[PDB]
Amino acid sequence: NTAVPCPVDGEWDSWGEWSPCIRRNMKSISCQEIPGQQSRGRTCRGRKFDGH
Amino acid sequence: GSCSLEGVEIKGGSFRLLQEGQALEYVCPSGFYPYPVQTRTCRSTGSWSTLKTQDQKTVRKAECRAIHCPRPHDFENGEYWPRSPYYNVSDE
Ligand SMILES: *[C@@H]1O[C@H](CO)[C@@H](O)[C@H](O)[C@H]1NC(C)=O
Ligand SMILES: *[C@H]1O[C@H](CO)[C@@H](O)[C@H](O)[C@@H]1O
Ligand SMILES: *[C@H]1O[C@H](CO)[C@@H](O)[C@H](O)[C@@H]1O
């Protein structure tokens, strides 16, 4: 019995929800021909004890 | 979003909204100029840009001040008269 816990590598979470599609200084771009940008987030969950 | 129009009015004048409310322009009467800032940009924090001078001094309230012609601070080989700290309109 060694009293040191082993490293565990973190695993990826699922992909989040897509952010609202806007453009800077372009009011609301809904139902128009104005291309915007949107984002999505993940979370590295589970890395403990100097894991990868 | 559009900036809030609170605390942005000027003492002795009005304003008009340009660039779809993303910039205000102060409208002082004839013979006055808006103190330092002529216009204000709408920064995306809810508040407008601060009343910064050319020396970057924070002015709290804005006011239409009188228009002065630039004073002669240098003149050689003669004498000009009268000397004044500032010159109002229609001075000779
Ligand atoms: C110009 O106008 C100001 C405004 O009050 C006044 O005080 C001053 O005496 C006037 N004349 C000159 C020469 O500055
Ligand atoms: C997000 O992207 C795809 C699903 O669209 C998969 O590779 C996985 O579920 C990931 O979390
Ligand atoms: C963003 O993209 C689509 C919606 O257009 C879906 O697969 C999901 O809601 C994702 O978050």
XYZ file of N, CA, C and O and ligand atoms in Angstrom:
612
model
N 0.850 -1.186 0.000
C 0.000 0.000 0.000
C 0.887 1.237 0.000
O 1.566 1.521 0.993
N 0.875 1.970 -1.110
C 1.527 3.267 -1.212
C 0.477 4.346 -0.984
O -0.593 4.317 -1.603
N 0.782 5.297 -0.097
C -0.176 6.312 0.330
C -0.178 7.554 -0.558
O -0.468 8.655 -0.071
N 0.131 7.413 -1.843
C 0.117 8.515 -2.795
C -0.887 8.167 -3.888
O -0.779 7.099 -4.491
N -1.875 9.018 -4.161
C -2.815 8.727 -5.249
C -2.166 8.922 -6.610
O -1.292 9.772 -6.795
N -2.610 8.117 -7.571
C -2.028 8.147 -8.901
C -2.624 9.286 -9.728
O -3.735 9.747 -9.448
N -1.884 9.785 -10.723
C -2.458 10.774 -11.644
C -3.592 10.191 -12.475
O -3.549 9.034 -12.898
N -4.614 11.013 -12.704
C -5.749 10.669 -13.553
C -5.875 11.732 -14.641
O -5.797 12.935 -14.360
N -6.013 11.287 -15.888
C -6.093 12.206 -17.013
C -7.519 12.714 -17.178
O -8.484 11.957 -17.047
N -7.646 14.008 -17.465
C -8.963 14.610 -17.603
C -9.605 14.266 -18.939
O -8.940 14.175 -19.971
N -10.922 14.092 -18.908
C -11.709 13.782 -20.091
C -12.563 14.980 -20.487
O -12.897 15.839 -19.665
N -12.917 15.023 -21.768
C -13.706 16.121 -22.303
C -15.170 15.952 -21.923
O -15.689 14.833 -21.871
N -15.837 17.073 -21.657
C -17.281 17.073 -21.491
C -17.946 17.147 -22.865
O -17.283 17.232 -23.902
N -19.275 17.114 -22.878
C -19.999 17.276 -24.127
C -19.955 18.734 -24.576
O -19.677 19.648 -23.793
N -20.221 18.941 -25.863
C -20.274 20.290 -26.407
C -21.504 21.019 -25.884
O -22.581 20.434 -25.740
N -21.337 22.306 -25.591
C -22.399 23.107 -25.019
C -23.421 23.548 -26.047
O -23.536 22.990 -27.142
N -24.182 24.569 -25.676
C -25.200 25.134 -26.548
C -24.636 26.328 -27.307
O -23.789 27.068 -26.799
N -25.113 26.500 -28.537
C -24.616 27.563 -29.399
C -25.111 28.922 -28.915
O -26.274 29.083 -28.537
N -24.208 29.901 -28.922
C -24.521 31.245 -28.467
C -25.394 31.960 -29.501
O -25.484 31.520 -30.651
N -26.088 33.036 -29.103
C -26.850 33.824 -30.084
C -25.962 34.460 -31.146
O -24.871 34.958 -30.861
N -26.451 34.430 -32.384
C -25.683 34.836 -33.560
C -25.897 36.328 -33.782
O -26.938 36.747 -34.294
N -24.912 37.138 -33.390
C -24.955 38.586 -33.553
C -23.710 39.067 -34.300
O -22.822 38.291 -34.649
N -23.667 40.377 -34.542
C -22.513 41.062 -35.095
C -22.393 42.402 -34.383
O -23.399 43.015 -34.007
N -21.150 42.841 -34.186
C -20.884 44.042 -33.407
C -21.294 45.289 -34.178
O -20.941 45.452 -35.352
N -22.055 46.154 -33.493
C -22.533 47.438 -34.007
C -23.413 47.246 -35.246
O -23.339 47.994 -36.224
N -24.238 46.185 -35.222
C -25.163 45.913 -36.319
C -26.587 45.614 -35.834
O -27.298 44.819 -36.468
N -27.025 46.284 -34.755
C -28.335 46.117 -34.112
C -28.757 44.660 -33.886
O -28.062 43.922 -33.180
N -29.878 44.240 -34.459
C -30.235 42.836 -34.568
C -30.070 42.425 -36.023
O -30.553 43.118 -36.925
N -29.372 41.318 -36.250
C -29.125 40.823 -37.597
C -30.116 39.725 -37.992
O -29.847 38.948 -38.909
N -31.264 39.661 -37.324
C -32.228 38.604 -37.589
C -32.960 38.853 -38.902
O -33.359 39.982 -39.204
N -33.155 37.770 -39.665
C -33.858 37.773 -40.959
C -33.243 38.736 -41.978
O -33.952 39.391 -42.744
N -31.914 38.832 -41.986
C -31.197 39.693 -42.916
C -30.020 38.935 -43.516
O -29.726 37.798 -43.139
N -29.346 39.581 -44.462
C -28.145 39.031 -45.095
C -26.875 39.580 -44.455
O -25.969 40.062 -45.138
N -26.798 39.520 -43.129
C -25.628 39.993 -42.392
C -24.975 38.804 -41.697
O -25.563 38.236 -40.765
N -23.779 38.387 -42.112
C -23.126 37.250 -41.451
C -22.546 37.638 -40.099
O -21.912 38.686 -39.946
N -22.775 36.777 -39.111
C -22.264 37.000 -37.771
C -21.390 35.865 -37.277
O -20.883 35.073 -38.078
N -21.196 35.777 -35.961
C -20.389 34.724 -35.360
C -21.071 34.219 -34.096
O -21.832 34.943 -33.449
N -20.785 32.964 -33.752
C -21.346 32.345 -32.559
C -20.317 31.393 -31.964
O -19.370 30.976 -32.635
N -20.512 31.052 -30.690
C -19.529 30.291 -29.932
C -20.179 29.099 -29.239
O -21.403 29.003 -29.120
N -19.324 28.187 -28.775
C -19.738 26.991 -28.056
C -18.609 26.598 -27.114
O -17.431 26.769 -27.438
N -18.970 26.074 -25.948
C -17.996 25.808 -24.906
C -18.026 24.376 -24.413
O -19.073 23.730 -24.369
N -16.846 23.887 -24.037
C -16.652 22.592 -23.390
C -15.982 22.801 -22.032
O -15.692 23.929 -21.626
N -15.735 21.699 -21.324
C -15.146 21.765 -19.989
C -14.285 20.531 -19.764
O -14.800 19.409 -19.747
N -12.981 20.734 -19.592
C -12.085 19.649 -19.201
C -12.344 19.310 -17.737
O -12.058 20.116 -16.845
N -12.888 18.120 -17.484
C -13.370 17.736 -16.162
C -12.758 16.399 -15.774
O -12.902 15.414 -16.506
N -12.082 16.364 -14.627
C -11.588 15.118 -14.061
C -10.087 15.029 -13.860
O -9.614 13.997 -13.363
N -9.299 16.044 -14.211
C -7.846 15.963 -14.080
C -7.453 16.299 -12.647
O -7.629 17.436 -12.198
N -6.920 15.313 -11.927
C -6.431 15.501 -10.569
C -5.070 14.833 -10.419
O -4.717 13.926 -11.179
N -4.308 15.320 -9.431
C -3.057 14.705 -8.965
C -1.975 14.665 -10.046
O -1.369 13.623 -10.302
N -1.740 15.825 -10.675
C -0.713 16.011 -11.712
C -0.943 15.120 -12.934
O 0.002 14.598 -13.530
N -2.209 14.943 -13.310
C -2.531 14.158 -14.481
C -2.311 14.923 -15.772
O -2.007 16.116 -15.778
N -2.462 14.209 -16.885
C -2.342 14.837 -18.193
C -3.550 15.725 -18.467
O -4.677 15.424 -18.065
N -25.781 47.356 -26.982
C -26.982 48.161 -27.104
C -26.703 49.650 -27.114
O -25.553 50.074 -27.018
N -27.762 50.445 -27.237
C -27.616 51.893 -27.231
C -27.340 52.398 -25.817
O -27.827 51.847 -24.824
N -26.539 53.456 -25.739
C -26.161 54.032 -24.460
C -27.330 54.795 -23.843
O -28.243 55.259 -24.531
N -27.288 54.919 -22.521
C -28.305 55.663 -21.796
C -28.000 57.153 -21.857
O -26.850 57.573 -21.699
N -29.041 57.951 -22.083
C -28.913 59.402 -22.223
C -29.056 60.137 -20.897
O -29.628 61.231 -20.849
N -28.543 59.572 -19.809
C -28.682 60.152 -18.480
C -27.371 60.806 -18.064
O -26.304 60.190 -18.161
N -27.457 62.053 -17.601
C -26.277 62.783 -17.182
C -25.384 63.245 -18.308
O -24.206 63.528 -18.075
N -25.909 63.327 -19.531
C -25.125 63.692 -20.704
C -25.575 64.995 -21.345
O -24.974 65.420 -22.335
N -26.614 65.640 -20.818
C -27.058 66.911 -21.369
C -26.085 68.029 -20.997
O -25.254 67.898 -20.094
N -26.197 69.142 -21.716
C -25.245 70.241 -21.622
C -25.968 71.475 -21.090
O -27.157 71.682 -21.366
N -25.264 72.264 -20.282
C -25.818 73.479 -19.689
C -25.915 74.556 -20.762
O -24.914 75.166 -21.142
N -27.128 74.793 -21.257
C -27.362 75.853 -22.217
C -27.344 75.400 -23.662
O -26.856 76.123 -24.537
N -27.872 74.213 -23.929
C -27.910 73.707 -25.290
C -28.565 72.345 -25.328
O -28.891 71.754 -24.293
N -28.750 71.851 -26.552
C -29.374 70.551 -26.770
C -28.423 69.617 -27.506
O -27.217 69.877 -27.573
N -28.955 68.531 -28.066
C -28.140 67.569 -28.794
C -28.998 66.852 -29.830
O -30.230 66.910 -29.799
N -28.320 66.172 -30.754
C -28.972 65.358 -31.769
C -28.236 64.031 -31.883
O -27.014 63.967 -31.729
N -28.993 62.972 -32.156
C -28.448 61.622 -32.205
C -28.043 61.282 -33.635
O -28.880 61.296 -34.544
N -26.762 60.980 -33.827
C -26.231 60.543 -35.108
C -25.707 59.119 -34.985
O -25.501 58.608 -33.880
N -25.496 58.495 -36.152
C -24.996 57.118 -36.274
C -25.903 56.107 -35.571
O -25.427 55.160 -34.940
N -27.220 56.326 -35.690
C -28.263 55.501 -35.063
C -28.137 55.456 -33.538
O -28.203 54.395 -32.914
N -27.950 56.630 -32.938
C -27.859 56.737 -31.496
C -26.547 56.294 -30.890
O -26.438 56.250 -29.659
N -25.548 55.967 -31.707
C -24.245 55.546 -31.214
C -23.274 56.707 -31.042
O -22.109 56.475 -30.699
N -23.725 57.940 -31.274
C -22.905 59.130 -31.083
C -23.834 60.326 -30.958
O -24.728 60.503 -31.789
N -23.629 61.138 -29.926
C -24.365 62.384 -29.769
C -23.473 63.554 -30.160
O -22.262 63.527 -29.927
N -24.076 64.577 -30.760
C -23.386 65.814 -31.103
C -24.070 66.958 -30.371
O -25.282 67.152 -30.514
N -23.298 67.706 -29.587
C -23.851 68.827 -28.841
C -24.148 69.993 -29.774
O -23.358 70.316 -30.665
N -25.298 70.624 -29.569
C -25.744 71.747 -30.393
C -25.869 72.953 -29.469
O -26.909 73.178 -28.841
N -24.794 73.736 -29.365
C -24.814 75.019 -28.682
C -25.284 76.100 -29.648
O -25.183 75.935 -30.868
N -25.829 77.231 -29.137
C -26.246 78.320 -30.039
C -25.101 79.022 -30.761
O -23.926 78.699 -30.557
N -25.443 79.989 -31.612
C -24.446 80.686 -32.417
C -23.643 81.637 -31.539
O -24.209 82.512 -30.877
N -22.322 81.467 -31.539
C -21.438 82.221 -30.674
C -20.845 81.423 -29.534
O -20.031 81.967 -28.779
N -21.221 80.156 -29.383
C -20.705 79.295 -28.333
C -20.117 78.029 -28.940
O -20.426 77.650 -30.073
N -19.260 77.379 -28.164
C -18.713 76.079 -28.502
C -18.924 75.147 -27.319
O -18.910 75.594 -26.167
N -19.181 73.863 -27.572
C -19.332 72.912 -26.461
C -17.991 72.690 -25.779
O -16.979 72.454 -26.444
N -17.989 72.790 -24.445
C -16.758 72.645 -23.684
C -16.273 71.195 -23.788
O -17.075 70.286 -24.022
N -14.991 70.941 -23.486
C -14.065 70.416 -24.505
C -14.649 69.597 -25.644
O -14.414 69.908 -26.816
N -15.400 68.549 -25.304
C -15.852 67.590 -26.304
C -16.923 68.203 -27.199
O -17.868 68.853 -26.731
N -16.731 68.059 -28.510
C -17.756 68.437 -29.472
C -18.825 67.359 -29.560
O -20.023 67.660 -29.561
N -18.400 66.101 -29.613
C -19.277 64.946 -29.655
C -18.860 63.976 -28.559
O -17.831 64.151 -27.900
N -19.672 62.940 -28.368
C -19.361 61.862 -27.442
C -19.622 60.526 -28.120
O -20.642 60.349 -28.792
N -18.691 59.596 -27.949
C -18.852 58.250 -28.471
C -19.560 57.382 -27.441
O -19.397 57.561 -26.231
N -20.360 56.441 -27.933
C -21.105 55.526 -27.073
C -20.260 54.272 -26.876
O -20.261 53.367 -27.714
N -19.512 54.234 -25.776
C -18.800 53.022 -25.400
C -19.793 51.961 -24.951
O -20.847 52.263 -24.387
N -19.440 50.703 -25.185
C -20.371 49.600 -24.952
C -20.355 49.117 -23.502
O -20.134 47.941 -23.215
N -20.589 50.047 -22.571
C -20.724 49.738 -21.155
C -21.981 50.336 -20.536
O -22.222 50.127 -19.342
N -22.785 51.071 -21.308
C -23.963 51.743 -20.820
C -23.773 53.231 -20.599
O -24.749 53.989 -20.660
N -22.542 53.662 -20.347
C -22.219 55.062 -20.137
C -21.437 55.595 -21.330
O -20.730 54.851 -22.016
N -21.572 56.896 -21.572
C -20.881 57.536 -22.677
C -19.420 57.786 -22.314
O -18.972 57.520 -21.194
N -18.665 58.303 -23.281
C -17.268 58.636 -23.046
C -17.170 59.846 -22.128
O -18.002 60.755 -22.188
N -16.152 59.846 -21.269
C -16.001 60.888 -20.265
C -15.647 62.222 -20.919
O -15.091 62.281 -22.020
N -15.985 63.309 -20.222
C -15.745 64.663 -20.725
C -14.267 64.996 -20.541
O -13.864 65.749 -19.651
N -13.447 64.417 -21.411
C -12.005 64.591 -21.351
C -11.586 65.771 -22.215
O -12.088 65.955 -23.328
N -10.666 66.572 -21.690
C -10.178 67.745 -22.396
C -9.033 67.335 -23.321
O -8.778 66.149 -23.547
N -8.325 68.321 -23.872
C -7.062 68.034 -24.537
C -5.945 67.760 -23.538
O -4.911 67.198 -23.917
N -6.133 68.146 -22.276
C -5.230 67.814 -21.185
C -5.683 66.581 -20.413
O -5.064 66.247 -19.397
N -6.760 65.924 -20.867
C -7.326 64.715 -20.248
C -7.814 64.949 -18.816
O -7.635 64.105 -17.935
N -8.446 66.098 -18.585
C -9.045 66.410 -17.293
C -10.503 65.969 -17.277
O -11.245 66.191 -18.237
N -10.908 65.331 -16.180
C -12.277 64.848 -16.040
C -13.183 66.010 -15.646
O -13.095 66.524 -14.527
N -14.050 66.426 -16.565
C -15.062 67.440 -16.299
C -16.369 66.724 -15.996
O -16.759 65.798 -16.718
N -17.043 67.141 -14.924
C -18.257 66.454 -14.495
C -19.445 66.797 -15.390
O -20.027 65.915 -16.032
N -19.819 68.071 -15.441
C -20.929 68.535 -16.258
C -20.406 69.363 -17.425
O -19.371 70.027 -17.324
N -21.138 69.319 -18.536
C -20.804 70.073 -19.734
C -21.608 71.368 -19.782
O -22.712 71.457 -19.238
N -21.043 72.371 -20.452
C -21.625 73.706 -20.500
C -21.147 74.394 -21.771
O -19.985 74.249 -22.155
N -22.042 75.131 -22.427
C -21.662 75.908 -23.605
C -20.951 77.174 -23.141
O -21.562 78.044 -22.513
N -19.663 77.285 -23.451
C -18.879 78.466 -23.120
C -18.700 79.348 -24.351
O -18.923 78.924 -25.487
N -18.303 80.595 -24.104
C -18.234 81.592 -25.162
C -17.035 81.351 -26.073
O -16.025 80.765 -25.672
N -17.157 81.818 -27.313
C -16.124 81.639 -28.328
C -15.140 82.797 -28.241
O -15.533 83.966 -28.320
N -13.860 82.474 -28.078
C -12.796 83.465 -28.056
C -11.899 83.289 -29.274
O -11.600 82.161 -29.679
N -11.484 84.409 -29.863
C -10.447 84.369 -30.878
C -9.097 84.083 -30.218
O -8.888 84.427 -29.050
N -8.178 83.422 -30.931
C -6.863 83.113 -30.343
C -6.042 84.375 -30.113
O -5.918 85.220 -31.001
N -5.479 84.492 -28.905
C -4.718 85.664 -28.512
C -3.329 85.651 -29.156
O -2.742 84.588 -29.364
N -2.796 86.813 -29.498
C -1.425 86.896 -30.015
C -0.448 86.761 -28.859
O -0.275 87.685 -28.056
N 0.221 85.615 -28.791
C 1.199 85.366 -27.746
C 2.630 85.632 -28.202
O 3.578 85.392 -27.440
N 2.802 86.140 -29.420
C 4.132 86.386 -29.962
C 3.991 87.378 -31.108
O 3.231 87.126 -32.048
N 4.718 88.495 -31.037
C 4.731 89.490 -32.107
C 6.023 90.284 -32.019
O 6.379 90.765 -30.940
N 6.704 90.442 -33.153
C 8.036 91.027 -33.182
C 8.069 92.287 -34.039
O 7.236 92.482 -34.929
N 9.055 93.140 -33.735
C 9.388 94.349 -34.500
C 8.271 95.390 -34.493
O 8.089 96.123 -35.469
N 7.525 95.480 -33.398
C 6.459 96.455 -33.317
C 5.658 96.279 -32.041
O 6.085 95.608 -31.096
N 4.480 96.902 -32.043
C 3.586 96.919 -30.894
C 2.149 96.795 -31.372
O 1.718 97.555 -32.244
N 1.414 95.839 -30.809
C -0.010 95.676 -31.062
C -0.783 96.041 -29.802
O -0.310 95.822 -28.685
N -1.972 96.621 -29.985
C -2.720 97.136 -28.842
C -4.217 97.018 -29.095
O -4.670 97.315 -30.210
N -5.014 96.617 -28.087
C -4.642 96.313 -26.698
C -4.331 94.841 -26.434
O -4.758 93.969 -27.189
N -3.598 94.577 -25.355
C -3.314 93.216 -24.923
C -4.383 92.772 -23.933
O -4.748 93.525 -23.025
N -4.881 91.554 -24.112
C -5.965 91.022 -23.304
C -5.702 89.551 -23.027
O -5.023 88.883 -23.818
N -6.202 89.025 -21.901
C -6.065 87.579 -21.650
C -6.840 86.727 -22.635
O -6.418 85.605 -22.939
N -7.964 87.229 -23.135
C -8.696 86.592 -24.215
C -9.435 87.680 -24.974
O -9.597 88.800 -24.486
N -9.884 87.342 -26.178
C -10.554 88.296 -27.052
C -11.944 87.786 -27.394
O -12.088 86.710 -27.985
N -12.961 88.572 -27.042
C -14.341 88.240 -27.359
C -14.600 88.412 -28.857
O -13.720 88.782 -29.642
N -15.841 88.142 -29.256
C -16.233 88.321 -30.647
C -16.330 89.810 -30.953
O -16.708 90.614 -30.089
N -15.951 90.183 -32.180
C -15.983 91.549 -32.712
C -15.012 92.502 -32.024
O -15.194 93.721 -32.091
N -13.978 91.983 -31.370
C -12.918 92.836 -30.859
C -11.958 93.189 -31.989
O -11.797 92.435 -32.953
N -11.331 94.357 -31.873
C -10.396 94.842 -32.881
C -9.050 95.146 -32.242
O -8.988 95.795 -31.193
C -15.235 89.918 -22.911
O -16.386 89.252 -22.343
C -16.238 88.881 -20.961
C -17.492 88.128 -20.576
O -17.939 88.484 -19.274
C -15.997 90.125 -20.105
O -15.779 89.733 -18.755
C -14.789 90.898 -20.620
O -14.639 92.113 -19.893
C -14.936 91.203 -22.116
N -13.788 91.944 -22.632
C -12.510 91.523 -22.701
C -11.539 92.507 -23.279
O -12.146 90.407 -22.322
C -19.198 17.733 -29.513
O -19.144 17.526 -30.908
C -19.699 16.280 -31.427
C -21.222 16.359 -31.381
O -21.641 17.408 -32.247
C -19.102 15.037 -30.700
O -17.792 14.773 -31.192
C -19.063 15.206 -29.151
O -20.323 14.869 -28.560
C -18.556 16.589 -28.696
O -18.892 16.687 -27.308
C -26.092 24.490 -31.850
O -26.418 24.122 -33.173
C -27.720 23.490 -33.404
C -28.800 24.561 -33.375
O -28.790 25.227 -34.631
C -27.977 22.302 -32.428
O -27.282 21.146 -32.883
C -27.568 22.629 -30.961
O -28.591 23.369 -30.290
C -26.202 23.316 -30.857
O -26.105 23.763 -29.502
